[PDB]
């Protein structure tokens with residue numbers, strides 16, 4: 082570090098170069114370990130910082146529980162979320178990702194088994210799909226009561242009965258394995274958001290949140306429990322509120338409010354936050370059809386919709402229906418009224434044309450009943466290609482001839498041409514827009530620096546120039562390793578920077594991330 | 606190698622007309638636009654072939670009695686109550702039509718499943734032909750666009 | 751097009767000051783910076 086810290090700080094020194102060059106088995110041994118950041122260090126001028134990256138933590142920014150959490154976060158902040166909480170959303174990501182890298186290290190005999198399932202989750206939900214093809218390939222051979230036939234050999238229908246009871250087993254081993262891989266994380270982001278709300282702000286003492294914000298009201302059941310911050314690493318949050326609010330209000334009211342055999346009020350609260358978590362319910366519904374898959378074999382054909390949740394350019398299709406969805410109900414709400422408004426006119430003038438019959442000798446079928454004339458238009462008039470002039474007798478020799486051409490030629494030119502274009506239009510332009518936001522993030526991170534926010538133009542200006550600015554000088558992984566490194570340092574051991582940062586991290590100002598300039602934007 | 610095969614049959618000199626494709630510019634672009642965006646194309650036809658399958662399981666397990674490609678019952682009536690044959694009935698007739706599946710299905714009027722079968726058709730038109738066969742054409746034209 | 755003009759007004763008022771006509775870039779430059787320029791310094795209700 083010392084040989085580095087002069088080469089970075091003082092260039093144009095020929096004495097140091099031959100001095101540096103004989104240490105090349107050392108500097109090119111430690112460059113795996115030499116994490117560099119840049120901060121605005123207390124003097125209104127920006128200086129480098131050098132530290133130690135451990136090796137048990139360089140190999141846990143692999144292990145794709147974390148890399149899944151990175152690519153969700155990176156797409157989260159740079160899409161929406163303004164500058165006033167950009168970096169505050171960064172440190173709120175680095176706080177959680179340390180808890181994942183502790184969870185990744187620990188991943189009677191039951192504890193040995195339970196870590197086999199949380200380890201192999203992504204490699205087991207993939208197996209729960211390949212079985213569901215082999216059910217819905219075998220199930221294609223049915224014939225009519227419904228008995229299966231064979232085409233290959235005699236041993237076909239037992240292999241369905243084997244692969245069906247196997248599928249309930251695997252789909253039960255993918256909500257066990259989900260229960261010990263992601264549920265401890267969503268517990269942690271819930272406990273932080275309650276512990277950092279009653280303490281730094283106070284709501285169960287001062288605000289008392291209303292009947293709106295339901296998840297505020299459910300959190301009231303956990304503060305009376307004993308082992309409250311079970312994952313939030315901060316086991317003295319109970320005493321910090323008493324020393325903060327025990328004098329404006331009673332020291333006895335707070336101690337009533339706060340405080341083989343297990344805690345029961347916490348365990349009732351832990352399940353209360355799993356079942357409203359959105360990604361867990363799909364893992365339940367994917368399992369509860371498997372139990373229903375033995376009452377009838379066809380229910381393993383609803384497991385093919387894991388193609389939808391399981392890919393990327395098919396997850397976007399499924400999301401495009403409800404992305405623009407609020408304008409969608411209001412338009413179908415207009416389409417169902419215009420077709421109704423063309424049913425009142427057709428009922429009150431034109432009963433005599435509506436014959437779905439066969440040439441009059443048949444006891445002719447009519448559509449002179451209001452609800453049945455209504456469902457005649459919605460089922461035949463919309464879905465046709467020419468409007469309503471198809472299933473209506475040809476008007477030629479009639480008193481209402483011109484008064485009925487107008488009734489058809491608007492119907493085609495007001496419902497099928499217009500109103501069933503901007504129904505398809507609000508779905509395709511949803512998919513045409515949502516596939517662009519996931520392309521801008523692919524671009525907005527490759528022509529801008531994340532933490533500086535500078536640009537590819539200024540930082541290029543040398544051969545191979547943006548690459549080194551994001552692989553040495555910022556490299557936002559390093560800003561997470563740095564805040565992992567402060568924790569293992571003793572508080573007496575903090576150097577000059579590492580206790581101006583760590584003090585600022587407690588008060589949470591975040592003025593020390595380099596806002597505008599980096600290093601080369603003030604030197605030369 | 607088609608020219609050598611062009612003497613075993615004269616029609617094989619009609620596969621040499623595709624040198625119009627490799628040989629121009631604004632027709633080389635058409636040919637390349639199919640596979641330029643092609644990775645999202647298989648994943649979507651991979652969804653279209655599953656939704657139509659998922660509407661075959663429902664139609665097989667509830668609605669055999671409507672699927673008559675026959676002539677008025679005195680004919681030894683043709684059915685579609687066989688799973689693979691009901692599947693290729695939807696992929697060949699239900700997609701390529703203009704109104705979904707309410708064309709080659711008998712008109713449901715006096716039935717116990719009347720409202721439960723309008724819903725089976727009006728989604729099929731509003732989930733496969735309107736949506737899913739727009740963003741199949743959409744991934745080809747916006748590739749060329 | 752008409753659903754876009756009602757989206758630009760939703761944007762042209764949230765990345766510009768109405769009466770200054772300055773922009774979100776210059777007035778941000780501090781933590782929480784455009785919000786106070788339009789809730790104290792101009793806030794066009796106050797001019798009414």
Ligand SMILES: Nc1ncnc2c1ncn2[C@@H]1O[C@H](COP(=O)(O)OP(=O)(O)OP(=O)(O)O)[C@@H](O)[C@H]1O
Pocket residue numbers: 148152526527529530531532551555556557558
């Ligand atoms: N501050 C930054 N930190 C890291 N990367 C940055 C930063 N600013 C811009 N980038 C760009 O973002 C890219 C990082 O995204 P990239 O996809 O390469 O990550 P990855 O290691 O490939 O993992 P994944 O593909 O899962 O995201 C870098 O190549 C870099 O060009």
Ligand SMILES: Nc1ncnc2c1ncn2[C@@H]1O[C@H](COP(=O)(O)OP(=O)(O)OP(=O)(O)O)[C@@H](O)[C@H]1O
Pocket residue numbers: 763764766767768769788792793794795
């Ligand atoms: N000069 C300005 N005066 C007021 N608002 C401004 C001005 N310049 C920009 N703005 C932006 O316009 C927004 C005001 O529109 P906003 O929709 O918030 O009004 P509102 O109080 O919510 O009422 P309504 O929703 O009915 O318009 C402010 O939040 C501000 O960000």
Ligand SMILES: Cn1c(=O)c2c(ncn2C)n(C)c1=O
Pocket residue numbers: 176179180314568
């Ligand atoms: C113990 N501990 C902390 O003390 C801590 C932390 N993050 C911030 N702090 C302050 N983490 C993740 C942590 O485990």
Ligand SMILES: [Ca+2]
Pocket residue numbers: 573574575
């Ligand atoms: Ca010291």
Ligand SMILES: [Zn+2]
Pocket residue numbers: 530531532533534535550555599
């Ligand atoms: Zn930078």
Ligand SMILES: [Zn+2]
Pocket residue numbers: 767768769770771772787792
């Ligand atoms: Zn102004």
